[PDB]
Amino acid sequence: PILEKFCFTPHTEEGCLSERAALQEELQLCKGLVQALPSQQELPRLLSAACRLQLNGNLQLELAQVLAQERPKLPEDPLLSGLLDSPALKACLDTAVENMPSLKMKVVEVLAGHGHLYSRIPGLLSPHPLLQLSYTATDRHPQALEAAQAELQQHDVAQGQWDPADPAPSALGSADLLVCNCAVAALGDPASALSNMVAALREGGFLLLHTLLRGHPLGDIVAFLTSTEPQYGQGILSQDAWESLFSRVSLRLVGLKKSFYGSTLFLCRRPTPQDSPIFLPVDDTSFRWVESLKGILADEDSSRPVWLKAINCATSGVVGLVNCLRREPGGNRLRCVLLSNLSSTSHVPEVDPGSAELQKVLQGDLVMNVYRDGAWGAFRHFLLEEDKPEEPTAHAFVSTLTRGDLSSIRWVCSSLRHAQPTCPGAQLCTVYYASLNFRDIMLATG
């Protein structure tokens, strides 16, 4: 079985990978080497080699080219690929998936040769049972990405020749999702690439772009290095710079994921033709709103968006309602708004049409809109840790977890925690030494 958990994930979150240590130690290492102009990790090795040739006046050429760094291992470095493996990417991909009119998704990766997301995006969507994915990889040059062709084959991916500098080919046409990974890919310029992509994107589609922000320590570090290839150097900008850049190409920032060191994962949606929305209370206990929605949904001609907003009861299950209705005829028009605080102390935001919050959420046009203790987000599915839980206990027995496998003998908690000492016949005893008879071996061996 596929085991998953259902937790509230905010659209905007910062300091994603703070809890991680290895990343923190890596950042400490990197900054020191940068200071005044040591590990197996690739980026520390690159910095150490760059400084090794000279303590001052290093030649951009020599630091640009060096053995063990010519390979595209920069994405393999944890610092550059922190969020990618972190649960933020799953949240962003699921967000893109849910707000899709149909059950089919068309996603195109730009600069896949160095982005290498093609090895990660297809596998992450295995849980979804009814989802069909049309994945394809487009790069500036054919020879690029010539490696891993078998890896591409094992996943439903197809080739491409797009260089984001040029207009997007008709063969891609309009795609549901555009995934970039600009951090390791070399974008010639932000503006032109964003224009070409947003042109390539269907109405209401999504654009997942990963970039290393400037103004943060690692940002400055990468700015100093990677200077020889300006295209890579151009990719680094400021968070305000990126946000201002989007507006120029008419792209709305649905979600943001900012790491503790500077790396950020962006999700954007191409705006859709505005229309006057229908508002329908869903809080009545009498369930008298079923008729109202029934009439609103039934009309085939009507194409307006319909919003089911609950603001009184935090326990309203409007989320499940919209999840089911979206698969019924005419369900493509449903969109939810739910205010479920778990703490009475926190307030409840106003949602009147005049109120700013309703205007912002309407601009987002997201299907799911849940408020919880000062944050707008939606519930998501995450795989839980595979490891089995353990606790410190004083009563435990030796059990063969998988029958017939001596490699699976491990301690398990015992029922002897719930016992009575009063009964003379019970006589609970502490075990100092226990023996093994031939019967035990026969049993464990199966």
Amino acid letter, residue 227: S
What single DSSP character describes residue 297? H
Asked if residue 331 lies in contact with residue 321, where contact means CB atoms within 8 angstroms, the answer is no
**DSSP helix, strand, coil percent of the chain (3-state; round to 5):** 30, 20, 50
- Residue 279 token pair: 């508002």
Amino acid letter, residue 54: Q
Q: How many residues does the chain have?
A: 446
Of the CA atoms within 13 Å of residue 398, those in its CB half-sphere come to 11
Write out the H or E segment, with its range, that includes residue 355: none
Sheet containing 252-258: order of strands: 12-14, 252-258, 263-269, 201-212, 175-179, 104-110, 132-138
Pinpoint the alpha helices (H) of 299-343. Answer: 318-325
Tell me the resolution in Å: 3.5
What single DSSP character describes residue 269? E
What is the phi/psi pair of residue 109, to 5°? -95, 135
Asked if residue 222 lies in contact with residue 236, where contact means CB atoms within 8 angstroms, the answer is yes
Sheet containing 370-371: order of strands: 4-10, 376-383, 370-371, 334-339, 306-310, 278-281
Q: What span, in angstroms and rounded, lies between the C-alpha atoms of 419 and 398?
A: 19
Cβ partners under 8 Å of residue 58, min gap 6: 37, 50, 51
Strand extents, DSSP E, 15-113: 104-110
Asked if residue 272 lies in contact with residue 304, where contact means CB atoms within 8 angstroms, the answer is no
- Residue 266 token pair: 């962006």
Distances (CA, A) of 62 to 40, 65, 66: 21, 5, 7
Cβ partners under 8 Å of residue 167, min gap 6: 196, 199
The three-class DSSP label of residue 292 is: helix
Amino acid letter, residue 55: L
- Residue 303 token pair: 């194409």
Asked if residue 37 lies in contact with residue 51, where contact means CB atoms within 8 angstroms, the answer is yes
Distances (CA, A) of 110 to 249, 366, 378: 17, 24, 28
Of the candidates 83, 90, 78, 85, the residue with the CA atom closest to the CA atom of residue 16: 83
Q: What span, in angstroms and rounded, lies between the C-alpha atoms of 96 and 370?
A: 16
> What residue has token string 């859709």?
272
Strand extents, DSSP E, 189-346: 201-212, 252-258, 263-269, 278-281, 306-310, 334-339
Q: What span, in angstroms and rounded, lies between the C-alpha atoms of 92 and 262?
A: 18
* Long-range contacts, stretch 20-28, CB < 8 angstroms, 24+ apart: 20/82, 22/78, 23/78, 23/79, 23/82, 23/260, 23/261, 24/260, 26/78, 26/79, 27/79, 27/217, 27/218, 27/261
Q: What span, in angstroms and rounded, lies between the C-alpha atoms of 208 and 267?
A: 5
The three-class DSSP label of residue 108 is: strand
Cβ partners under 8 Å of residue 407, min gap 6: none
Cβ partners under 8 Å of residue 60, min gap 6: 227, 228
Strand extents, DSSP E, 29-129: 104-110
Write out the H or E segment, with its range, that includes residue 9: strand 4-10
The three-class DSSP label of residue 105 is: strand
Dihedral in degrees, nearest 10, Cα atoms 350, 356, 362, 365: -100
- Residue 422 token pair: 């009063």
As a whole number of Å, the end-to-end CA separation of the chain is 25
Distances (CA, A) of 33 to 27, 36, 55: 10, 7, 11
Q: What span, in angstroms and rounded, lies between the C-alpha atoms of 135 and 159?
A: 9
> What residue has token string 């935001």?
349
Q: What span, in angstroms and rounded, lies between the C-alpha atoms of 281 and 293?
A: 10
